[PDB]
Design a protein around this nucleic acid. Structure first.
Ligand SMILES: NC(=O)COCCOCC(N)=O
Ligand SMILES: Cn1cc(N)cc1C(=O)O
Ligand SMILES: Cn1cc(N)cc1C(=O)O
Ligand SMILES: Cn1cc(N)cc1C(=O)O
Ligand SMILES: Cn1cc(N)cc1C(=O)O
Ligand SMILES: Cn1cc(N)cc1C(=O)O
Ligand SMILES: Cn1cc(N)cc1C(=O)O
Ligand SMILES: Cn1cc(N)cc1C(=O)O
Ligand SMILES: Cn1cc(N)cc1C(=O)O
Ligand SMILES: Cn1cc(N)cc1C(=O)O
Ligand SMILES: Cn1cc(N)cc1C(=O)O
Ligand SMILES: Cn1cc(N)cc1C(=O)O
Ligand SMILES: Cn1cc(N)cc1C(=O)O
Ligand SMILES: Cn1cc(N)nc1C(=O)O
Ligand SMILES: Cn1cc(N)nc1C(=O)O
Ligand SMILES: Cn1cc(N)nc1C(=O)O
Ligand SMILES: Cn1cc(N)nc1C(=O)O
Ligand SMILES: [Cl-]
Ligand SMILES: [Cl-]
Ligand SMILES: [Cl-]
Ligand SMILES: [Cl-]
Ligand SMILES: [Mn+2]
Ligand SMILES: [Mn+2]
Ligand SMILES: [Mn+2]
Ligand SMILES: [Mn+2]
Ligand SMILES: [Mn+2]
Ligand SMILES: [Mn+2]
Ligand SMILES: [Mn+2]
Ligand SMILES: [Mn+2]
Ligand SMILES: [Mn+2]
Ligand SMILES: [Mn+2]
Ligand SMILES: [Mn+2]
Ligand SMILES: [Mn+2]
Ligand SMILES: [Mn+2]
Ligand SMILES: [Mn+2]
Lengths: 88, 98, 107, 99, 81, 98, 101, 107
DNA sequence: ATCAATATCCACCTGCAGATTCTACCAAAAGTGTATTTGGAAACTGCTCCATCAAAAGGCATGTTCAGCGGAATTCCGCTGAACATGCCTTTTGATGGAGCAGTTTCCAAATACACTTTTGGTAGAATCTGCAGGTGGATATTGAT
DNA sequence: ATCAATATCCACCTGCAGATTCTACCAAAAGTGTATTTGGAAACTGCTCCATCAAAAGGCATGTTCAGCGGAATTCCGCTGAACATGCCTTTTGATGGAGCAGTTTCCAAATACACTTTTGGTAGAATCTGCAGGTGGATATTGAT
């Protein structure tokens, strides 16, 4: 087997406070409680888990090992969140 | 003296299942209509998802494999686990026989 | 002589019917032999799951006949079925008894 | 003697700035790891087309921005201008994601 | 007199709210509710009628309604599907 | 000289209606409403009785669920009384206004 | 030659979208990202209308999708004013097509 | 001996032949009438014209000559019917409409 | 805490709408063998593009200080909904013609799959073009202290 | 209301990535003509079950009284926004091995449409049977006044 792919852990913290602030600003938010950041991280994790689970299900069904933009697009459509701009 | 075209339904098959689960339990007419709607609803959702799956992968055929992936896409965790096991078991017995 | 596909698969649900419905429904050009069997099995299993829980709801209410109310109680009290039927209305099902605590009489 | 904008002034400036632009707001590499970490827990040895990750990011940011709009509405409804966890919780519950 | 929408009475709207777990209701709720129900009915009926006309009938059937509700994301069980 | 305090009977009513399943709007008034609305889309229409009932079951289930959301909004604002603004917020977040 | 490899061609509505764009705004261009969005839009609406037409045919026990099914599907899918104009364009196209052979 | 495209015969820019074929491969029904793909191509062409008209106007408004995703989003969201038609659609790189709630403003 | 008015429960009862049981009917369907056809797995492998180490660097995250002012606890009073009894008019219920939803048969306009023939939408390549992102800076607002 | 510290507007300017321009070629696709097949419009019409009307049923419209909820006014603690110093890790420009997605062709397990034949599954008129909705009685928990 090939070598080392460093263990991936705690990457949810990569979604920083400034990044969440920015997203809230685009959303029209003017003031933000200190507890919002962790709450938002938990919400994004759920959103991603759900979409990724479906996208990977499409990948495996096609007997591929590579998740395609189409796998994601189909997964999003399934969940009523149709995305334009990446094929399909 | 006309005919009244046959209107199929899963009523009789639902009733059989009922007796296997609760031998001494009945079911009202309205309740049974609700079960018929349920069976038709799940059939459409599963078949539809299986259809899209076949199309996405440029396949002309809907096989047990599309039904399976469809089930995993549609049903919640535990429910999916059992549905898959039941589906696999039924196909095995069917294949493993004549 | 001939034997029903349902009996072969050991199912109560009509494999032959499911097969017929798959094509007439225009889901695909062709239908593999195991598809309708697998599907019939899934439909039967889900049917058994709800009737099981519905029957229990009827028993808990001291009744022998399952009515819409019982199907609703069974579905809504089950996390997974509730999710599966999250966008379905069961006629004459009513709702689950539930009052926001802040609305209750003063302790 | 130093200059200082009042609290809320820069916040409002940021709103106008970000509502005018369309660039993704979450750092790209960190988002990619998050995606790879989550995917890995579901299935090991997976690869990703770069566009698959971008599709996930565009979808994720659109979802969060729209959620923050709903959250802001719940805060304003309670006569506040500060969004709190319960505003997000109320918004998700009404949307049917939670209950 | 009393025209149709008003037929949906205060006591009826209060019963609906009660089943929904509501303990206290503002006087302005009743008219708001009627307006909301009207929009709901308009949306569903419009689609049900479209299915009726397509079938070249003069009678709206339960199925026309069931189909209308389904495409509106409000699937109803107990009336045909 | 008996008199229940404000809220006691309301609470009693909540428990009663949450236990039953019967329709809460009177049939005739509902039917007139339905017919009037349909008249705008197509004149001289007839309705199967089951069509009107389906319309009433769906309408009440929708209104009951909306009232639950509406109640959550009132409570969010620390009130126990539902107001038009609560219904409005609920519909906006559901995407019916939005 | 050699062992060439005909990358299977992928179709899109791009050239047709381009034509319509010039009809409405002669001096306006469109980025590739926007065109991809337009291509997704046409496929999305195609699928939705076709799907509504499919169910509609099934509900009425018909095995043929005709312009009549498409028309009803358009009315069910499109909001008010868009439906009215789509129906006119559709009807006009069919009436013209049938007077040409 | 003069073979004219079905599109030209129909007075359309959109490909009738392609649409007819897509309707068949999509397995929407057993059969497809000749007028079906003509009607559908017309509707698709009309909707495209509608969104391109509005997007080009948004582009002009922002002093741009090339339509980008932002312009498509501005056009769709500022238009009541298109906004409803695409109510559950996300346009990549579209951003959002500027909108600050009244109570958040100063003084 | 102590009555006093009501509501709530529970065991029991039985009328009856609706579920169960019996019978005869028969068209709609599904099983299997035979012949004909083909979708798509299998095997070889071109070649796109994904994972990755490489390196410089400034955009941007982190962590801290400071205090403006928002959240939230408290008091409080005007007023608006809840509870309740009164008298009536609308809804419910059961009976009844007959409007259409359909069951039945007729039969042609129209939907194909195949063989040809051909125009074109796609694409691999490189080669000139161009809209505008982004850096610069000077003129016009917007803020916030006084 | 004058002032200064700053952000914002903006039309001019230009390197360059993304878009446009073509020569080239081409295999995948679509168009008219049989020849074969049939879905479903069309005409006729039996039989539901829908609209309607009158009598029996029972929910609701209505005015009064006041409990208690909603929100205005006030207070202040401490959280969160603004500003800033420090430096890290994301971003960018590039290149490379090679994983694995995908184009191409060989080929057989499996799928499909009859044609023939069997036993169900659905419908219907008739009689019979029952789970349970209400109805009653008496006990007792709940609510509210004192
Ligand atoms: N039973 C069959 O496989 C026969 O199908 C062919 C009939 O289709 C018309 C034609 N030219 O193909
Ligand atoms: C005689 N026969 C019996 C079948 N089941 C099929 C055939 C043919 O021939
Ligand atoms: C010609 N043929 C004979 C069959 N028994 C089936 C087929 C097909 O074709
Ligand atoms: C023999 N044949 C059969 C078709 N359907 C086409 C042709 C030609 O020739
Ligand atoms: C001779 N022929 C046979 C076909 N099926 C088509 C043609 C042409 O020519
Ligand atoms: C001459 N011809 C014969 C066909 N079958 C088709 C054509 C064309 O041309
Ligand atoms: C000219 N032509 C002859 C055909 N058989 C088809 C065509 C086309 O064109
Ligand atoms: C000669 N011909 C020309 C066509 N287009 C078809 C046929 C046949 O034969
Ligand atoms: C026999 N035939 C000839 C055609 N040109 C089409 C068909 C079919 O069959
Ligand atoms: C002629 N034929 C064709 C079929 N597929 C079946 C039969 C029999 O005979
Ligand atoms: C003779 N035959 C022809 C069919 N297609 C089926 C049978 C049987 O027998
Ligand atoms: C005898 N036979 C011939 C068929 N084609 C089918 C059967 C059966 O039996
Ligand atoms: C006995 N049999 C003969 C058939 N052709 C079909 C059947 C059945 O049974
Ligand atoms: C007897 N049989 C049963 C099935 N198919 C056939 C033939 O023959
Ligand atoms: C002739 N034949 C007999 C049969 N049972 N199937 C066919 C076909 O052909
Ligand atoms: C000339 N033509 C054009 C098309 N089909 C045909 C034949 O012949
Ligand atoms: C013989 N034939 C010629 C043609 N153009 N099509 C057919 C068929 O047959
Ligand atoms: Cl299969
Ligand atoms: Cl909170
Ligand atoms: Cl309000
Ligand atoms: Cl047509
Ligand atoms: Mn992990
Ligand atoms: Mn092949
Ligand atoms: Mn640092
Ligand atoms: Mn405050
Ligand atoms: Mn009042
Ligand atoms: Mn008549
Ligand atoms: Mn060309
Ligand atoms: Mn610029
Ligand atoms: Mn026919
Ligand atoms: Mn209060
Ligand atoms: Mn390899
Ligand atoms: Mn039987
Ligand atoms: Mn009882
Ligand atoms: Mn008593």
């Amino acid at each position: 087997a090939k070598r080392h792919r460093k263990v991936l852990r705690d990457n949810i913290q990569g979604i920083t406070k400034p990044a969440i602030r920015r997203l809230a600003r685009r959303g029209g938010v003017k003031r933000i409680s200190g507890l919002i950041y962790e709450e938002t991280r938990g919400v994004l994790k759920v959103f991603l888990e759900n979409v990724i689970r479906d996208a990977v299900t499409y990948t495996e069904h096609a007997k591929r090992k590579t998740v395609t933009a189409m796998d994601v697009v189909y997964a999003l459509k399934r969940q009523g969140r149709t995305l334009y701009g990446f094929g399909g | 003296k006309r005919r009244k075209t046959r209107k199929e339904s899963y009523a009789i098959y639902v009733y059989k299942v009922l007796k296997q689960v609760h031998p001494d339990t009945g079911i009202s007419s309205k309740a049974m209509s609700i079960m018929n709607s349920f069976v038709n609803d799940v059939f459409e959702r599963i078949a539809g998802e299986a259809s899209r799956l076949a199309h996405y992968n440029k396949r002309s055929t809907i096989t047990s494999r599309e039904i399976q992936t469809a089930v995993r896409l549609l049903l919640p965790g535990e429910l999916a686990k059992h549905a898959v096991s039941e589906g696999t078991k039924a196909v095995t017995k069917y294949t493993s026989a004549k | 002589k001939a034997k029903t596909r349902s009996s072969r698969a050991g199912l109560q649900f009509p494999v032959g019917r499911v097969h017929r419905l798959l094509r007439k429904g225009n889901y695909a050009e062709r239908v593999g032999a195991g598809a309708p069997v697998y599907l019939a099995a899934v439909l039967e299993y889900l049917t058994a799951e709800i009737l099981e829980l519905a029957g229990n709801a009827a028993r808990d209410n001291k009744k022998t006949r399952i009515i819409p109310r019982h199907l609703q109680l069974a579905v809504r009290n089950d996390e997974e079925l509730n999710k599966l039927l999250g966008r379905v209305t069961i006629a004459q099902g009513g709702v689950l008894p539930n009052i926001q605590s802040v609305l209750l009489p003063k302790k | 003697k130093p200059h200082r904008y009042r609290p809320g002034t820069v916040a409002l400036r940021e709103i106008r700035r970000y509502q005018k632009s369309t660039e993704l707001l979450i750092r790209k590499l960190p988002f990619q790891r998050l995606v790879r970490e989550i995917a890995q827990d579901f299935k090991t040895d997976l690869r990703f087309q770069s566009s698959a990750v971008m599709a996930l990011q565009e979808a994720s940011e659109a979802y969060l921005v729209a959620l923050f709009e709903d959250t802001n509405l719940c805060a304003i409804h309670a006569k506040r201008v500060t969004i709190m966890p319960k505003d997000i919780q109320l918004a998700r519950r009404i949307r049917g994601e939670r209950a």
